[PDB]
């Protein structure tokens, strides 16, 4: 009768096996370290988080052994996870180009529409690996995209956005097992929303009216449509649908012609950019 006997987490000091280099972001988003593992010399980037509960551990701790068993070239690889002095230290590989959304707020100024593309595409194999997994994200958004330093894309998981739920699909506003396949499209709708004008829609409103005025509006549209492609706008309404009949599935998008796309080169562009700024 097999069974599941440990997680992968363990209850050990990570200075006994890494070293920090300095702090990441000046906590524009969240506790986050630059560290080296002290043996093989390995880069990671260390998250720590201050867990409330054993229930809030352990619902982290079922997220990070999901994380450890994927295995997908646009999905950040575990290096190792702690838990010491009251601590969760998550430690993934390290992604040289940072997150989206941080790049954004650097350069103050959006991600054009080749550079959306190749982040499109790269975060939809990603995702297509989760669902076919039987795995949901829940919580794509800018904040989870990391680019390496080669201009490739790297899923992440507990990221926090660079500086409420913006991303939330309204039948899970409006149902409250309430996050599956289909919430995801819509976020990463969403993200891309995101990344066209570096916030996300009703970023301006009060945080207390977000829920339902996703209830109550219809799906978001980019603001200045004369900038952007047909295929972009399109991709887009395949992902913001609201009627979740007709909203497409990742093997669906994957077949998009906005997801086209076989140089990485507006990544490598970008990222040289903010490297030199
Ligand atoms: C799953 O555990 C982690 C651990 C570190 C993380 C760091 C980030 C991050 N946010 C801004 N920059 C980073 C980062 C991630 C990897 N390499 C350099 C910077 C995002 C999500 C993370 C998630």
Same mark, same amino acid.
Request: hydrophobic share 40%.
């Given at each position: 009768?097999?069974?599941?006997?440990?997680?992968?987490?363990?209850?050990?000091?990570?200075?006994?096996?890494?070293?920090?280099?300095?702090?990441?972001?000046?906590?524009?988003?969240?506790?986050?370290?630059?560290?080296?593992?002290?043996?093989?010399?390995?880069?990671?980037?260390?998250?720590?988080?201050?867990?409330?509960?054993?229930?809030?551990?352990?619902?982290? %701790?079922? #997220? &990070?052994?999901?994380?450890?068993?994927?295995?997908? $070239?646009?999905? @950040?690889? *575990?290096?190792? =996870?702690?838990?010491?002095?009251?601590?969760?230290?998550?430690?993934?590989?390290?992604?040289?180009?940072?997150?989206?959304?941080?790049?954004?707020?650097?350069?103050?100024?959006?991600?054009?529409?080749?550079?959306?593309?190749?982040?499109?595409?790269?975060?939809?194999?990603?995702?297509?690996?989760?669902?076919?997994?039987?795995?949901?994200?829940?919580?794509?958004?800018?904040?989870?995209?990391?680019?390496?330093?080669?201009?490739?894309?790297?899923?992440?998981?507990?990221?926090?956005?660079?500086?409420?739920?913006?991303?939330?699909?309204?039948?899970?506003?409006?149902?409250?097992?309430?996050?599956?396949?289909?919430?995801?499209?819509?976020?990463?709708?969403?993200?891309?929303?995101? %990344?066209? #004008? &570096?916030?996300?829609?009703?970023?301006?409103?009060? $945080?207390?009216? @977000?829920? *339902?005025?996703? =209830?109550?509006?219809?799906?978001?549209?980019?603001?200045?449509?004369?900038?952007?492609?047909?295929?972009?706008?399109?991709?887009?309404?395949?992902?913001?649908?609201?009627?979740?009949?007709?909203?497409?599935?990742?093997?669906?998008?994957?077949?998009?012609?906005?997801?086209?796309?076989?140089?990485?080169?507006?990544?490598?562009?970008?990222?040289?950019?903010?490297?030199?700024?």
């Amino acid at each position: 009768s097999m069974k599941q006997y440990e997680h992968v987490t363990r209850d050990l000091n990570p200075e006994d096996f890494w070293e920090i280099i300095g702090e990441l972001g000046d906590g524009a988003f969240g506790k986050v370290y630059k560290a080296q593992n002290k043996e093989t010399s390995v880069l990671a980037a260390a998250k720590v988080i201050d867990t409330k509960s054993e229930e809030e551990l352990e619902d982290y %701790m079922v #997220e &990070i052994d999901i994380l450890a068993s994927c295995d997908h $070239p646009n999905i @950040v690889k *575990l290096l190792d =996870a702690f838990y010491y002095e009251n601590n969760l230290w998550i430690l993934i590989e390290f992604c040289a180009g940072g997150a989206v959304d941080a790049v954004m707020l650097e350069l103050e100024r959006p991600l054009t529409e080749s550079q959306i593309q190749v982040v499109c595409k790269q975060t939809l194999d990603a995702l297509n690996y989760l669902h076919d997994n039987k795995i949901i994200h829940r919580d794509l958004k800018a904040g989870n995209i990391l680019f390496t330093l080669d201009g490739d894309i790297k899923l992440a998981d507990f990221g926090v956005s660079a500086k409420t739920p913006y991303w939330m699909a309204p039948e899970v506003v409006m149902c409250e097992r309430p996050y599956d396949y289909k919430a995801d499209v819509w976020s990463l709708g969403i993200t891309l929303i995101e %990344m066209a #004008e &570096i916030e996300p829609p009703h970023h301006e409103l009060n $945080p207390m009216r @977000v829920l *339902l005025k996703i =209830a109550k509006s219809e799906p978001p549209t980019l603001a200045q449509p004369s900038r952007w492609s047909s295929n972009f706008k399109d991709f887009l309404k395949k992902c913001l649908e609201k009627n979740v009949d007709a909203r497409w599935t990742t093997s669906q998008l994957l077949q998009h012609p906005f997801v086209t796309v076989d140089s990485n080169k507006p990544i490598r562009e970008l990222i040289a950019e903010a490297k030199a700024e």
